[PDB]
Amino acid sequence: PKLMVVVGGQAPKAIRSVECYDFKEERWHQVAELPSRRCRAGMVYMAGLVFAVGGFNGSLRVRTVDSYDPVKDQWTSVANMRDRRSTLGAAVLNGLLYAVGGFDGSTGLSSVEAYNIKSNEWFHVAPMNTRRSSVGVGVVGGLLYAVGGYDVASRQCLSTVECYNATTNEWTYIAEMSTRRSGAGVGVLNNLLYAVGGHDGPLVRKSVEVYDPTTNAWRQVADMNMCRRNAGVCAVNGLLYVVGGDDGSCNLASVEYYNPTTDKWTVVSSCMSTGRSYAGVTVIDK
Amino acid sequence: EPEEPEADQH
């Protein structure tokens, strides 16, 4: 029994709303709202809590971090990050929460920091090879991957991907994606890393590609039903869910899921209370 | 400062 949790986002401005999808009831619910309006935050499930990391409050990029206890339905502040980070990616690897890249209000970041829940402290780890704002991240096979994004040095949306090894504290480029994707959704399903949508300038992608670490190669799968950048992504019960996002002009309220056995994308019949982009998405135990 | 994400700033 899982619940999909969707936190904040732009609809069209930063909001506090936190919605949960109950797969058994097949209904959405509003749960405890974020203490402050947020979009473009990282989102992870760790130690039974949902961590909302950084983001944008409509005015400033922030270094705040809050954790949500699904049982108590309560948000609590945790230690601020070292750096302001908005449009970062966040992931858990070996019990540490990583905040990867993003934008601090000035420039995109190659820096990365990690959070130790035992000490409630953040510390920098090795930076990425490239600055990446609007970066997606995923963990598979004990490695952390930073996928696409935007590099202000070259003013390019990125087709490159790099992988972090926590044992050596090193980032290394892996195989390049087929196309540039800033704002790609990233998920992991059946030992494959998915890069979902994104954009290259005003060109928003409906294409999706998958990466196999054992072969270090990418290939494309079925297109989504619609173009999406800044969509949230999670894996549930053998399917990959893609939540909201925008098509470059409008924020989307729809969710669609991918079935890797049928190579088909299906739009979920029940949409969120409103179209939202840049929302944090994760899955928790019910 | 611009409210848009960095990738969207011009």
Author numbering:
A (entry chain A): 306 to 591
B (entry chain C): 557 to 566
Publication passage describing the model:
KLHL3 is the substrate-recognition subunit of the ubiquitin ligase complex, recruiting substrates for ubiquitylation via its associated Kelch domain. KLHL2 shares 84% sequence identity with KLHL3 across the Kelch domain, and 86% identity overall. KLHL2 has also been implicated recently as a CUL3 substrate adaptor for WNK kinases. We determined the high-resolution crystal structures of the Kelch domains of human KLHL3 and KLHL2 in separate complexes with the 11-residue WNK4 degron motif.
Two Kelch domains were found in the asymmetric unit of each structure. The KLHL2 structure was solved at 1.6 Å (1 Å=0.1 nm) resolution in space group P43212, whereas the structure of KLHL3 was determined at 1.8 Å in space group P212121. The KLHL2 and KLHL3 structures were determined at pH 7.5 and pH 4.3 respectively, which probably contributes to differences in the resolution of particular residues. For the KLHL2 structure, residues 292–305 from the N-terminus and residues 592–593 from the C-terminus were not clearly resolved in the electron density and were excluded from the model, as was the C-terminal residue of the WNK4 peptide (Gln567). WNK4 Gln567 was disordered in both structures, consistent with a lack of stabilizing side-chain contacts, yet was critical for peptide binding. The presented structures reveal that KLHL2 and KLHL3 bind to the WNK1/4 degron in an almost indistinguishable manner and maintain strict conservation of all critical contact residues. Consistent with this, we found that the WNK1/4 degron motif bound to the Kelch domain of KLHL2 with similar affinity to KLHL3. Our data further support the recent finding that KLHL2 may also function as a second CUL3 adaptor for the WNK kinases. Thus far, no mutations in KLHL2 have been described in patients with Gordon's syndrome, but the binding data strongly suggest that KLHL2 will also play a role in regulating WNK isoforms. KLHL2 is best known for its high expression in the brain, whereas KLHL3 may play a dominant role in the kidney, consistent with the effects of KLHL3 mutations in hypertension.
